[PDB]
Ligand binder design. Structure first.
Ligand SMILES: O=C(NCC/C=C/Cn1ccc2cnccc21)c1cc(-c2ccc(F)cc2)cc(O)c1O
Ligand SMILES: [Cl-]
Ligand SMILES: [Cl-]
Ligand SMILES: [Mg+2]
Length: 214
Protein backbone atom coordinates (compact mmCIF):
# COMPACT_ATOMS: atom_id res chain seq x y z
CA UNK A 1 0.00 0.00 0.00
CA UNK A 2 1.02 3.59 0.52
CA UNK A 3 4.16 4.72 2.31
CA UNK A 4 4.61 6.80 5.45
CA UNK A 5 5.81 9.68 3.25
CA UNK A 6 2.65 9.52 1.13
CA UNK A 7 0.57 9.49 4.34
CA UNK A 8 2.40 12.62 5.59
CA UNK A 9 1.73 14.43 2.26
CA UNK A 10 -1.97 13.43 2.29
CA UNK A 11 -2.27 14.58 5.89
CA UNK A 12 -0.84 18.00 5.00
CA UNK A 13 -3.15 18.31 2.00
CA UNK A 14 -6.15 17.52 4.19
CA UNK A 15 -5.17 19.41 7.40
CA UNK A 16 -3.25 22.49 6.25
CA UNK A 17 -4.15 25.60 4.24
CA UNK A 18 -2.82 25.78 0.64
CA UNK A 19 -0.25 28.56 0.34
CA UNK A 20 0.37 28.72 4.13
CA UNK A 21 3.78 27.33 4.94
CA UNK A 22 3.36 27.63 8.71
CA UNK A 23 0.18 25.45 8.55
CA UNK A 24 2.14 22.89 6.53
CA UNK A 25 4.89 22.67 9.16
CA UNK A 26 2.32 22.38 11.92
CA UNK A 27 0.45 19.61 10.08
CA UNK A 28 3.66 17.62 9.55
CA UNK A 29 4.70 18.01 13.20
CA UNK A 30 1.23 16.97 14.45
CA UNK A 31 1.20 13.91 12.25
CA UNK A 32 4.66 12.87 13.32
CA UNK A 33 3.91 13.43 17.02
CA UNK A 34 0.52 11.72 17.06
CA UNK A 35 0.66 9.12 14.30
CA UNK A 36 4.06 8.04 12.92
CA UNK A 37 7.57 9.30 13.70
CA UNK A 38 9.54 10.50 10.65
CA UNK A 39 12.98 11.99 10.10
CA UNK A 40 11.91 15.60 9.48
CA UNK A 41 14.13 18.13 11.26
CA UNK A 42 11.11 18.92 13.51
CA UNK A 43 10.06 21.94 15.48
CA UNK A 44 12.77 21.99 18.23
CA UNK A 45 15.70 22.05 15.83
CA UNK A 46 13.52 23.92 13.30
CA UNK A 47 13.31 26.90 15.65
CA UNK A 48 17.11 27.03 15.77
CA UNK A 49 17.21 26.87 11.93
CA UNK A 50 14.77 29.71 11.75
CA UNK A 51 16.96 31.86 14.01
CA UNK A 52 20.05 31.12 11.86
CA UNK A 53 18.23 31.84 8.56
CA UNK A 54 16.95 35.14 9.91
CA UNK A 55 20.42 36.16 11.12
CA UNK A 56 22.08 35.57 7.71
CA UNK A 57 19.25 36.20 5.19
CA UNK A 58 20.95 34.00 2.61
CA UNK A 59 20.30 34.65 -1.09
CA UNK A 60 21.29 31.15 -2.21
CA UNK A 61 20.95 28.06 -0.02
CA UNK A 62 21.91 24.46 -0.85
CA UNK A 63 20.18 21.66 1.06
CA UNK A 64 21.52 18.12 1.02
CA UNK A 65 18.61 15.77 1.79
CA UNK A 66 15.03 16.92 1.23
CA UNK A 67 13.09 13.91 2.53
CA UNK A 68 9.44 15.17 2.51
CA UNK A 69 10.28 18.85 2.18
CA UNK A 70 9.86 19.93 5.79
CA UNK A 71 13.19 21.71 6.08
CA UNK A 72 12.80 23.13 2.56
CA UNK A 73 9.44 24.64 3.57
CA UNK A 74 10.93 25.88 6.83
CA UNK A 75 13.85 27.67 5.10
CA UNK A 76 12.07 28.83 1.95
CA UNK A 77 9.27 30.51 3.91
CA UNK A 78 11.87 32.85 5.51
CA UNK A 79 13.81 33.71 2.34
CA UNK A 80 13.59 37.21 0.93
CA UNK A 81 11.94 37.85 -2.43
CA UNK A 82 14.14 36.52 -5.18
CA UNK A 83 16.30 34.34 -2.85
CA UNK A 84 16.56 30.66 -3.80
CA UNK A 85 16.95 27.21 -2.37
CA UNK A 86 18.40 24.23 -4.25
CA UNK A 87 17.68 20.89 -2.57
CA UNK A 88 19.35 17.60 -3.52
CA UNK A 89 17.36 14.36 -3.04
CA UNK A 90 18.64 10.95 -4.12
CA UNK A 91 15.34 9.09 -3.62
CA UNK A 92 12.93 9.77 -6.49
CA UNK A 93 9.79 9.01 -4.47
CA UNK A 94 10.93 11.51 -1.84
CA UNK A 95 11.80 14.06 -4.52
CA UNK A 96 8.20 13.79 -5.78
CA UNK A 97 6.75 14.14 -2.25
CA UNK A 98 8.99 17.17 -1.64
CA UNK A 99 7.87 18.84 -4.89
CA UNK A 100 4.21 18.30 -4.00
CA UNK A 101 4.79 19.58 -0.47
CA UNK A 102 6.39 22.76 -1.80
CA UNK A 103 3.61 23.18 -4.34
CA UNK A 104 1.01 22.90 -1.63
CA UNK A 105 2.90 25.41 0.56
CA UNK A 106 3.07 27.84 -2.42
CA UNK A 107 6.89 27.93 -2.28
CA UNK A 108 7.59 26.25 -5.63
CA UNK A 109 9.00 29.42 -7.24
CA UNK A 110 11.71 29.65 -4.55
CA UNK A 111 12.94 26.07 -4.59
CA UNK A 112 14.46 23.74 -7.15
CA UNK A 113 14.49 20.05 -6.26
CA UNK A 114 17.33 18.11 -7.76
CA UNK A 115 16.92 14.31 -7.87
CA UNK A 116 20.49 12.61 -7.70
CA UNK A 117 23.44 11.91 -5.45
CA UNK A 118 25.36 14.82 -3.92
CA UNK A 119 28.70 13.50 -5.17
CA UNK A 120 27.36 13.65 -8.73
CA UNK A 121 25.38 16.90 -8.51
CA UNK A 122 27.75 19.13 -6.52
CA UNK A 123 30.32 19.22 -9.40
CA UNK A 124 27.51 20.32 -11.73
CA UNK A 125 26.29 23.30 -9.71
CA UNK A 126 28.44 25.94 -11.37
CA UNK A 127 28.08 25.04 -15.04
CA UNK A 128 24.65 23.39 -15.09
CA UNK A 129 22.84 25.34 -12.33
CA UNK A 130 24.68 28.68 -12.76
CA UNK A 131 25.87 28.84 -9.14
CA UNK A 132 28.80 31.08 -8.25
CA UNK A 133 29.15 30.56 -4.48
CA UNK A 134 26.72 29.42 -1.84
CA UNK A 135 25.58 31.56 1.10
CA UNK A 136 24.42 28.66 3.24
CA UNK A 137 24.40 24.88 3.13
CA UNK A 138 22.04 22.69 5.17
CA UNK A 139 23.42 19.17 5.60
CA UNK A 140 20.76 16.52 6.25
CA UNK A 141 21.60 13.59 4.00
CA UNK A 142 23.75 10.51 4.71
CA UNK A 143 25.67 11.25 7.89
CA UNK A 144 28.86 9.69 6.50
CA UNK A 145 28.70 12.14 3.59
CA UNK A 146 28.82 15.37 5.61
CA UNK A 147 32.62 15.47 5.65
CA UNK A 148 33.32 14.30 2.07
CA UNK A 149 30.70 16.67 0.67
CA UNK A 150 32.06 19.61 2.65
CA UNK A 151 35.48 18.89 1.11
CA UNK A 152 33.91 18.53 -2.34
CA UNK A 153 32.09 21.83 -2.01
CA UNK A 154 35.39 23.47 -1.19
CA UNK A 155 37.20 21.72 -4.09
CA UNK A 156 34.51 22.88 -6.53
CA UNK A 157 34.91 26.53 -5.45
CA UNK A 158 31.38 26.76 -4.05
CA UNK A 159 32.31 28.14 -0.60
CA UNK A 160 33.18 31.77 0.07
CA UNK A 161 34.33 33.62 3.20
CA UNK A 162 31.29 33.58 5.43
CA UNK A 163 29.41 30.63 3.83
CA UNK A 164 27.33 29.09 6.65
CA UNK A 165 27.21 25.29 6.95
CA UNK A 166 24.37 24.11 9.23
CA UNK A 167 24.41 20.39 9.95
CA UNK A 168 21.54 18.29 11.36
CA UNK A 169 21.98 15.16 13.47
CA UNK A 170 25.52 15.77 14.58
CA UNK A 171 24.74 13.84 17.79
CA UNK A 172 22.07 11.34 16.64
CA UNK A 173 22.74 9.45 14.45
CA UNK A 174 25.95 11.47 14.72
CA UNK A 175 28.62 12.76 12.42
CA UNK A 176 31.86 12.30 14.35
CA UNK A 177 34.32 12.74 11.52
CA UNK A 178 32.64 15.93 10.27
CA UNK A 179 32.56 17.41 13.78
CA UNK A 180 36.19 16.58 14.54
CA UNK A 181 37.24 18.02 11.20
CA UNK A 182 35.41 21.34 11.26
CA UNK A 183 36.09 21.94 14.95
CA UNK A 184 39.80 21.32 14.40
CA UNK A 185 40.17 23.33 11.20
CA UNK A 186 41.27 26.95 11.10
CA UNK A 187 39.09 27.25 7.97
CA UNK A 188 35.89 26.96 10.04
CA UNK A 189 34.40 28.86 12.95
CA UNK A 190 32.05 26.46 14.72
CA UNK A 191 29.15 26.66 17.13
CA UNK A 192 27.07 23.84 18.59
CA UNK A 193 23.32 24.31 19.20
CA UNK A 194 22.11 21.61 21.56
CA UNK A 195 18.56 20.43 21.06
CA UNK A 196 16.46 17.27 20.69
CA UNK A 197 15.91 14.66 18.05
CA UNK A 198 12.75 15.40 16.12
CA UNK A 199 9.63 14.38 18.04
CA UNK A 200 11.62 12.60 20.81
CA UNK A 201 13.09 13.26 24.23
CA UNK A 202 16.55 12.30 22.94
CA UNK A 203 19.40 14.85 22.80
CA UNK A 204 20.57 15.92 19.35
CA UNK A 205 22.06 19.12 18.00
CA UNK A 206 22.91 21.30 15.04
CA UNK A 207 26.42 22.42 14.19
CA UNK A 208 27.05 25.73 12.52
CA UNK A 209 30.43 25.88 10.76
CA UNK A 210 31.23 29.17 9.03
CA UNK A 211 33.82 28.89 6.26
CA UNK A 212 36.77 31.30 6.65
CA UNK A 213 38.55 30.75 3.29
CA UNK A 214 41.62 28.55 2.69
O1 LIG B 1 19.20 9.29 7.88
C1 LIG B 1 18.77 10.46 8.06
N1 LIG B 1 18.80 11.35 7.05
C2 LIG B 1 19.25 11.03 5.71
C3 LIG B 1 18.16 10.29 4.89
C4 LIG B 1 18.57 10.02 3.49
C5 LIG B 1 19.74 10.35 2.88
C6 LIG B 1 20.04 10.01 1.45
N2 LIG B 1 20.23 11.22 0.67
C7 LIG B 1 19.30 12.27 0.57
C8 LIG B 1 19.77 13.21 -0.35
C9 LIG B 1 21.04 12.72 -0.84
C10 LIG B 1 21.99 13.15 -1.76
N3 LIG B 1 23.09 12.45 -2.01
C11 LIG B 1 23.31 11.31 -1.34
C12 LIG B 1 22.43 10.75 -0.42
C13 LIG B 1 21.29 11.48 -0.16
C14 LIG B 1 18.27 10.84 9.40
C15 LIG B 1 18.09 9.84 10.35
C16 LIG B 1 17.60 10.11 11.61
C17 LIG B 1 17.40 9.04 12.59
C18 LIG B 1 17.58 9.31 13.96
C19 LIG B 1 17.39 8.36 14.93
C20 LIG B 1 17.02 7.09 14.52
F1 LIG B 1 16.83 6.12 15.46
C21 LIG B 1 16.85 6.76 13.18
C22 LIG B 1 17.05 7.75 12.21
C23 LIG B 1 17.25 11.44 11.92
C24 LIG B 1 17.40 12.46 10.97
O2 LIG B 1 17.04 13.75 11.26
C25 LIG B 1 17.93 12.18 9.72
O3 LIG B 1 18.11 13.23 8.88
CL1 LIG C 1 13.29 17.71 6.96
CL1 LIG D 1 10.37 18.33 17.61
MG1 LIG E 1 17.98 15.06 9.93
Amino acid sequence: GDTKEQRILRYVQQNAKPGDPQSVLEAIDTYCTQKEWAMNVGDAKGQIMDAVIREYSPSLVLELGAYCGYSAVRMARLLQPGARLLTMEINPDCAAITQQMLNFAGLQDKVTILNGASQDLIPQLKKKYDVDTLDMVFLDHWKDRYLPDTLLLEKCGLLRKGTVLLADNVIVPGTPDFLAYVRGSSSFECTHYSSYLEYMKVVDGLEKAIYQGP
